[PDB]
Amino acid sequence: AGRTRIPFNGVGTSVLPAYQTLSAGQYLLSPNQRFKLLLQGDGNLVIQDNGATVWVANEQQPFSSTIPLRNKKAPLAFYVQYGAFLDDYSRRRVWLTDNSTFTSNDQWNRTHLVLQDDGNIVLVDSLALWNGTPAIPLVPGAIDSLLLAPGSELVQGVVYGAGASKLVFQGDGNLVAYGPNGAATWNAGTQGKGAVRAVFQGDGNLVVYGAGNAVLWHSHTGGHASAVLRLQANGSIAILDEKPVWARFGFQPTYRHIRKINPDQKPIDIWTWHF
């Protein structure tokens, strides 16, 4: 008793979800569209940079293993089941990633592959604690996403941008995310209720307070100090608890993981590592 895979149907997006079979001809693109992860018909798994191959899945890739594949019926396929696996009979091989040590069996359901805007492919244990906009696709790995760290006040009237989208704690006291076409994709519905403050707290809860620290609205995500709040260029807003467990560069099993930062100390949705 345990999950079976289904065919991937997300060609051109930046994420390969768990237990989904990517087959020949299918590909991911980074959100900025510069990079493409392609499974070729010749059985090579390839990353291309503006159309040119700059990486190939093989034995020379740090923290990956190649073991025999004797099963004759195994179709060419690439998929994620905590670790990533490339079944390539043509070379009698399974190529797979040596992930960081697993902490829970739940990770098998939550871990997906992200093709980032910096060209890295990263396996990320990802849990959406709150998703304000379930109809809008989650798009990890984009340089133009806005991330707020816990402990970030949303100053009233300030427009926080992510490409053409924005998040605003408005003069009328509503907390609103606007999508690329100028329409609201989500709002807390707190206009006219005396809202005085909106804050993504240190405990990972997004809260709008009124007079006397009255709670007018909250995301019910308290107790997650490692969560981030993300506004995407497509208008998606969500609170996520995420950690990487493999990457093709930068990653080492014993290194600590952190998000890259802008020159003004703001975090970016791109994973990196250091001791």
Residue numbers in the entry: 2 to 276
Tell me what the authors wrote about this structure, in their words.
Putidacin A (or LlpABW), first identified in Pseudomonas putida BW11M1, represents a class of Pseudomonas-specific antibacterial proteins not related to any known bacteriocin. The crystal structure of LlpABW from P. putida BW11M1 (LlpABW) shows it contains two β-prism MMBL domains, referred to as the N-domain and the C-domain following their position in the amino acid sequence. For the protein containing two similarly folded domains, we constructed site-specific mutants affected in carbohydrate binding and domain chimers from LlpA homologues to show that mannose-specific sugar binding mediated by one domain is required for activity and that the other domain determines target strain specificity. The LlpA branch occupies a unique position among MMBL-domain proteins, harboring non-eukaryotic representatives and being equipped with the capacity to kill bacterial cells with bacteriocin-like specificity, a property not yet demonstrated for other family members.
Soaks with oligomannoses revealed additional sugar-binding subsites. Binding site IIIC accommodates the disaccharide Manα(1–2)Man and the pentasaccharide GlcNAcβ(1–2)Manα(1–3)[GlcNAcβ(1–2)Manα(1–6)]Man. In the case of the pentasaccharide, the central reducing mannose is located in the shallow Me-Man binding site and the two GlcNAcβ(1–2)Man moieties stretch out over the surface making only a few additional hydrogen bonds or van der Waals contacts. Far UV CD spectra of these mutant forms are identical to that of native protein LlpABW, indicating that the mutations do not affect the overall structure of the protein. Isothermal titration calorimetry (ITC) showed that LlpABW has an affinity of 2.1 mM for the pentasaccharide GlcNAcβ(1–2)Manα(1–3)[GlcNAcβ(1–2)Manα(1–6)]Man, the highest among all the tested oligo-mannosides (See Figure 5 and Table 1 for a summary of the experimentally validated LlpABW-carbohydrate interactions).
